[PDB]
């Protein structure tokens, strides 16, 4: 695929019609059509009308009489819409019919009409000597040999040349033309050499390497800038041609080099021509903005010389000084030799220099179109750094980038109505346990919960999380876009949530279109509203679970409680508007009508009753614990007596509180109620408040009481914090390989030339950094970069500092992105629940690994891509054992990692576990090395084998996470399933095959028969808040619901020796 292959043909000579077609070249009989006779476009947001003629007419000098035609006043009939097609057509047709080029018709098959000269004679009304020539001898336009087409005119006229004006290709752009062509007498090569030598004397003049019609012609520019725009467009065409010549494609281009030669030019033109023969650009299929092309090519040039090796620099300078010479690759010249040997008479630009060797410069990325780049900074590269200076980032305007505190949700509509529920586990509640649980409860209440957990609970509010979603549902409605949904469907209820108006249906599925001129206001949801609808859905679901239509049965009542429940009641009412006889009362303090205002304790006379209850009452903020206890007990008793299916909030879900609730219900109803600890996806993600679903049933409940429950655990583990919570900083300086950075971001900007340095230093802290430039004009690159602790855990294992700086230099200036529009980023980005959970495990383990003494190494097994590395302290050595991981030996050497690209062997005998090590089997035993799910028995065999292998070792510690069976029975009950769901009895974590779960009792049983000491442990709330505050992550709406159950039922097994 070496030698260039191309067809050379003169597209311009091909374009010129035979004389017989000239009479009908105007398409006199048939009307002009888009994509053939012409093409037109209006550009919205810029208000421009671009009309380009096609066929011979693409090249046309309009007469002043031609511009007097209506077709050119058409854009004037607007702004702003596109010109109607019928009018553009009628006008263009009448105009084309108006033109009548002078010609002689002839029988000979060899002739072509010389369209250029005939059009030019027309445009000047045959006043110019070429014009009056065309008039007295129209036959002089006919030619068989393309060069003689002009020679006959030059000799008849005695002229040395003709200066033909070039109109803009757009014919609505009647403005001064950048340059004009000048056909010359030539025809021998010697005459061409002479004119080229004489054009060095003139001012702003250029040529192509070869010429149409085999007739020398030069360009003459009004200004240096026009020459720059033309030279740029040509450098682009030749780069794009060379790209597919080098690829071995056949090419039908008119000339081997499409670049211009500056016969006489400004300095900038010389530098453009210099950089145009170096072919710096990497191949690209992206659309480019031509309008600023010159600037891009100038900036590219300024950078190319700015960081090229000294010989390449001198080569660039040589081209820059010998601008008259045409530099070209050897293969180009082989192509020229070919076309000369084919047609010996051909005229090529004589002064050329063949590159004996192509320059070895780095290819430059050059996507000048819209969109920011999301770089994934690699930890190491070929470049070695040594005491690099701090790169200050400039402050950026809010116009360029706003930084909101918390990323809004991007869920599907149904996804926010989901709920999870933790069923009770223990069959009895001994008084000795009641003492300890009550003491832990009063202790937790008196000291309050963690300040960090409270900060996240108050910052990541659900209402603001769901606002973009609900508003869109509203905006589609008022603009009439929505019109089809089931009644009682979650889309219906969400529409009722979104819009404050009655929503009638025309037929079973179609929604009634809004009366014209009427746009109902958005419904005003307070923060607790979505939760209320979510619990309504939850109560309809617990009633049936097979349900598709969440809609009250006729003659059935629900009674929402709690302060300010009005919007939810209005939404529920409008949602059930088609259902006959549905009471939907509200209650609570601060209630406005319809909702009755009342306070806890309810007045003793009052007698509420319903088939459904949803208590969402808050506890009094300041009271003795016995007071809140008696209050919430009275609440639960009221709600339970009031309705067959209550759903009451518990603000302080201590084991003591919830169990005492079950006790009070037991002595209230005789037989135990079927309680369950619900948590909806529309709760604020960090909330430790949890709903309880109470309902009498004919069956006698086994295991009425809760113990070590997940919903309880979220509250109980939020013990008062030891350190004031971390606040997401925004760093500006980028120190070279300095460890000290509080978690946050690196928003800011820097000059484009300093961008490769900033990215190369950013990689020390940031896994990835997004960058862009506002415009081709701006020299600054704005950069954002979340600080990921894992990257810090990798990059500070050794003092070595290396980066792909040479690769980043390829981006400057057009490879870092462009975005005129404002971008918003967040101090708290969304991540999948599973990822957050993994971080919780990594924190739970890291907190312990720092504590343990005399541990020579940490060994992750199956932890792909060093996923477990955040856990290991920087001084301790880190071994990885996964076939999937691939690392250069120099990289592991650079970072003190030791990868063994072999599968871990789970057989107990050959498993050579070292002493004084910390093995890590986090989320690996459930899956085979190829990723297929193992049977649970095989997981038991794995844990048995690692335990037996740990039996001989001293000071060894192992962590073995595994999914628990209980979660399955949980997820069968729950409707939430955004990222975690049951699949034929296995749980399917997202982007993974579903895997069989283990029973914890059987695991502790086998572990205690093996006799090795062990502890079952799960990450707690402090670990959640630690991972979130450190990684800059916010829990999702669905994530907050699923996370408690998913985390509690994915225990780590802490084996120890």
């Amino acid at each position: 695929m070496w030698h260039y292959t191309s067809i050379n043909n003169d597209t311009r000579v091909a374009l010129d019609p035979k004389p017989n077609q000239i009479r009908t070249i105007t398409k006199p009989n048939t009307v002009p059509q888009l994509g053939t006779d012409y093409l037109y476009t209006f550009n919205s947001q810029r208000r421009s009308h671009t009309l380009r003629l096609l066929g011979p007419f693409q090249y046309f000098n309009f007469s002043e009489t031609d511009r007097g035609h209506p077709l050119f006043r058409l854009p004037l009939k607007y702004p702003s819409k596109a010109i109607p097609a019928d009018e553009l057509i009628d006008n263009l047709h009448s105009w084309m019919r108006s033109v009548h080029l002078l010609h002689v018709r002839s029988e000979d098959n060899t002739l072509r009409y010389n369209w250029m000269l005939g059009v030019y004679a027309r445009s000047t009304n045959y006043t110019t000597p070429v014009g009056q020539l065309v008039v007295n001898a129209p036959a002089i336009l006919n030619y068989s040999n393309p060069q003689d087409a002009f020679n006959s005119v030059f000799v008849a006229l005695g002229i040395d040349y003709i200066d033909i004006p070039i109109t803009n290709s757009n014919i609505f752009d009647d403005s001064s033309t950048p340059y004009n062509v000048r056909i010359w007498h030539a025809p021998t090569m010697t005459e061409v050499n002479h004119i080229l030598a004489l054009m060095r004397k003139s001012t702003l003049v250029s040529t192509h390497s070869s010429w149409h019609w085999n007739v020398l012609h030069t360009f003459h520019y009004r200004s240096e800038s026009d020459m720059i725009d033309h030279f740029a467009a040509k450098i682009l065409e030749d780069w794009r041609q060379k790209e597919k010549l080098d690829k071995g494609a056949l090419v039908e281009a008119d000339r081997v080099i499409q670049r211009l030669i500056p016969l006489s030019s400004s300095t900038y033109v010389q530098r453009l021509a210099a950089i145009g023969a170096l072919y710096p650009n990497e191949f690209t299929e992206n659309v480019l903005d031509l309008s600023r092309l010159s600037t891009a090519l100038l900036q590219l040039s300024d950078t190319y010389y700015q960081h090229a090796n000294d010989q390449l620099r001198r080569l660039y300078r040589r081209m820059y000084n010998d601008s008259r010479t045409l530099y070209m690759t050897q293969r180009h010249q082989e192509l020229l030799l070919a076309q000369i040997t084919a047609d010996p008479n051909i005229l090529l630009y004589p002064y050329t220099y063949i590159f004996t060797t192509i320059p070895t410069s780095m290819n430059y990325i050059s996507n000048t179109g819209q969109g920011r780049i999301k770089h994934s900074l690699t930890v190491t590269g070929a470049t070695e750094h040594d005491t690099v200076a701090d790169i200050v980032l400039g402050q950026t305007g809010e116009d360029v980038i706003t930084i909101s505190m918390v990323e809004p949700m991007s869920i599907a509509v149904e996804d926010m109505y989901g709920y999870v529920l933790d069923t009770p586990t223990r069959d009895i509640w001994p008084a000795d346990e009641q003492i300890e649980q009550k003491g832990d409860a009063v202790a937790l209440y008196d000291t309050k919960t963690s300040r960090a957990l409270g900060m996240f609970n108050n910052t990541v509010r659900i209402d603001d999380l769901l606002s973009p979603l609900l508003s869109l549902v509203y905006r589609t409605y008022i603009k009439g876009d929505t019109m089809t949904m089931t009644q009682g469907s979650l889309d219906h209820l969400t529409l009722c949530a979104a819009v404050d108006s009655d929503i009638t249906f025309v037929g079973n599925r179609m929604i009634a279109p809004l009366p014209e001129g009427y746009i109902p206001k958005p419904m005003h949801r307070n923060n607790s509203t979505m939760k209320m609808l979510s619990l309504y859905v939850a109560l309809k679901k617990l009633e049936n679970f097979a349900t598709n239509s969440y809609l009250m049965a006729p003659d059935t009542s629900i009674i929402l409680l709690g302060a300010e429940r009005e919007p939810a009641v209005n939404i529920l009412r409008r949602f059930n508007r088609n259902v006959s006889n549905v009471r939907i009362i509200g209650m609570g303090d601060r209630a406005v009508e319809p909702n009755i205002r009342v306070r806890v304790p309810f007045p003793i006379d009052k007698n509420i009753s319903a088939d459904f209850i949803i208590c969402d009452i808050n506890s009094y903020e300041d009271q003795s614990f016995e007071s809140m206890f008696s209050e919430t007990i009275s609440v639960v008793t009221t709600c339970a007596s009031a309705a067959t299916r209550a759903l009451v909030k518990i603000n302080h879900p201590s084991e003591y509180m919830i169990n005492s609730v079950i006790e009070r219900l037991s002595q209230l109803g005789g037989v135990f109620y079927h309680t369950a600890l619900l948590k909806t996806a529309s709760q604020n993600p960090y909330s430790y408040e949890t709903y309880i679903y109470i309902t009498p049933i004919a069956a006698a409940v086994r295991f009425p009481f809760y113990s070590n429950s997940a919903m309880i655990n979220r509250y109980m583990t939020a013990v008062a914090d030891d350190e004031m919570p971390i606040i997401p900083s925004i760093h500006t300086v980028i120190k070279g390989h300095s460890n000290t950075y509080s978690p946050g971001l690196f928003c800011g900007c820097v000059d484009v030339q300093s961008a490769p340095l900033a990215l190369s230093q950013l990689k020390s802290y940031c896994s990835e950094a997004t960058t862009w430039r506002v415009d081709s004009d701006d020299n600054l690159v704005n950069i954002i970069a979340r600080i990921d602790p894992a990257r810090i855990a990798l990059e500070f294992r050794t003092r070595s500092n290396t980066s792909a700086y040479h690769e980043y230099q390829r981006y400057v200036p057009n490879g870092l992105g462009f975005k005129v529009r404002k971008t918003r980023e967040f101090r708290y980005m969304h991540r999948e629940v599973t990822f957050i959970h993994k971080l919780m495990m990594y924190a739970l383990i890291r907190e312990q690994i720092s504590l343990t003494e005399n541990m020579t190494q940490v060994v992750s097994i199956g932890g792909r891509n060093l996923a477990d590395i955040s856990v290991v302290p920087l001084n301790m050595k880190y071994v990885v054992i996964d076939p999937a991981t691939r690392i250069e030996t120099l990289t592991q050497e650079k970072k003190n990692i030791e990868v063994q690209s072999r599968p871990f062997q789970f057989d107990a005998a050959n498993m050579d576990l070292e002493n004084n090590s910390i093995y890590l089997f986090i989320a690996v035993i459930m899956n085979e090395p190829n990723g297929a799910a193992t049977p649970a028995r095989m997981q038991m065999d794995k844990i048995r084998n690692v335990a037996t292998a740990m039996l001989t070792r001293t000071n060894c510690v192992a962590y073995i996470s595994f999914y628990e069976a209980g979660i399955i029975t949980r997820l069968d009950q729950s409707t939430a399933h955004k990222t975690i769901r049951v699949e034929e009895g296995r749980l399917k974590v997202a982007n993974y095959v579903p895997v069989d779960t283990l029973v914890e009792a059987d695991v502790t049983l086998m572990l205690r028969d093996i006799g090795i000491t062990h502890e079952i442990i799960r990450p707690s709330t402090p670990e959640l808040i630690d991972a979130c505050s450190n990684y800059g992550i916010r829990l999702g709406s669905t994530g907050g619901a699923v996370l408690d159950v998913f985390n509690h039922y994915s225990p780590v097994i802490k084996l120890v020796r």
């Binding site: 002043e64 006043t127 009056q132 008039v135 001012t203 009004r222 200004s223 720059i228």
Partner: protein, 197 residues
């Protein structure tokens, strides 16, 4: 007044950057001939379309020259002094012999048509008596006739006088490229390292 406010909010002047774009001053100000040798241009003559200022732009388009940029070929053959590397001259109008109608005169007809509807719009705005209106119109038609009369004298005779004079020995500078939007004279100076240029 409104088109004027838009226009002048774009600014009374402009410069042409290295990119060749017109950057408007954005600032109302009177012109002085000092600026003639500056980088600045009067903005009315930019010929850059401006939304909502169309009438001003059009009436401006009335001023664009009807001639052509000749090369001073005879002066070149004689080696007469010429400061330009490519000596030239803007002849105000081309010869137009074979036509039934003089293109220069027809151009004046379109100019007078435009001014006619302009004055008309003004007169109806100011409730002018029909008689005075008819009289201004008659005056314009008269200008058209007079112009059609002298047109051949200009385009076909005076033009050649220009073409000769452009070749006279001491007519050494380039005076005008024919494009008002962009043209500025080349500015030579005698320059002592000692004293001022």
């Amino acid at each position: 007044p409104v088109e004027y406010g838009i226009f002048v909010q774009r600014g009374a002047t402009y410069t042409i950057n290295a990119a060749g774009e017109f950057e408007f001053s954005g600032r109302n100000e009177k012109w002085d001939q000092a600026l003639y040798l500056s980088e600045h241009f009067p903005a009315l003559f930019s010929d850059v379309p401006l939304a909502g200022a169309n009438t001003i732009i059009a009436i401006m388009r009335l001023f664009t020259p009807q001639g052509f940029l000749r090369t001073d070929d005879l002066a070149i053959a004689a080696n007469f002094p010429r400061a330009s590397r490519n000596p030239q001259t803007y002849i105000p109008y081309t010869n137009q012999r074979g036509t039934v109608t003089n293109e220069f005169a027809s151009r004046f007809r379109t100019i007078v048509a435009t001014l006619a509807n302009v004055v008309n719009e003004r007169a109806v705005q100011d409730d002018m008596q029909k008689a005075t209106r008819s009289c201004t119109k008659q005056w314009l038609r008269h200008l058209e006739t007079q112009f059609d009369n002298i047109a051949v004298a200009h385009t076909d005779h005076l033009s050649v006088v220009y073409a000769t004079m452009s070749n006279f020995m001491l007519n050494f500078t380039n005076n005008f490229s024919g494009n008002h939007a962009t043209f500025k004279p080349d500015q030579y100076v005698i320059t002592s390292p000692e004293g001022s240029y």
